[PDB]
């Protein structure tokens, strides 16, 4: 589970854009204050190979 991929973003990458940021994603109406909740999600996922 050490290998990760991003599932969520505001908008698509430009060519060779390198977005390192791991802040909680606001997916909707909820203001997230830096913590998980309804429409407040952790943006990364893992393959679990």
């Amino acid at each position: 589970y050490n290998y990760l991929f991003r599932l969520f973003r505001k908008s698509n990458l430009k060519p060779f854009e390198r977005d390192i940021s791991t802040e909680i994603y606001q997916a909707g109406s909820t203001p997230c204050n830096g913590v998980e909740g309804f429409n407040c999600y952790f943006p990364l996922q893992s393959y679990g190979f």
């Binding site: 060519p15 060779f16 854009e17 390198r18």
Partner: protein, 107 residues
């Protein structure tokens, strides 16, 4: 002596630093924390090292690369930009990988 480039500038996203130290130029890309009022008193994602005068520069960023041009010339009257023509020449190109939106000048 230098410039900052980025979007949040601080912490949450990467930003550039470019500085001249009077022997060398230092260039870096980090999740920096800036000063509240940056000055030259006397994370690690990329690094590179290398009134009568008008110094002219151009900066642009395309497809994750960043480009720099410049020229130096003497002046007669320092009140305003000297009314004439002289083309700027390329210096540097860097694979910085980031978008940029804000910049600042360093004293």
């Amino acid at each position: 002596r230098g410039w900052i480039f980025g979007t949040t500038l601080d912490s949450k996203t990467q930003s550039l630093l470019i500085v001249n130290n009077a022997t060398n130029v230092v260039i870096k890309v980090c999740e920096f924390q800036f000063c509240n009022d940056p000055f030259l008193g006397v994370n690690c994602t990329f690094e590179y090292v290398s009134f009568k005068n008008l110094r002219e520069f151009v900066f642009k960023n395309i497809d994750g690369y960043f480009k720099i041009y410049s020229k130096h010339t003497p002046i007669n009257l320092v009140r305003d930009l000297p009314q004439g023509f002289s083309a700027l020449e390329p210096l540097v190109d860097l694979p910085i990988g980031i978008n940029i939106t804000r910049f600042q000048t360093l004293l």
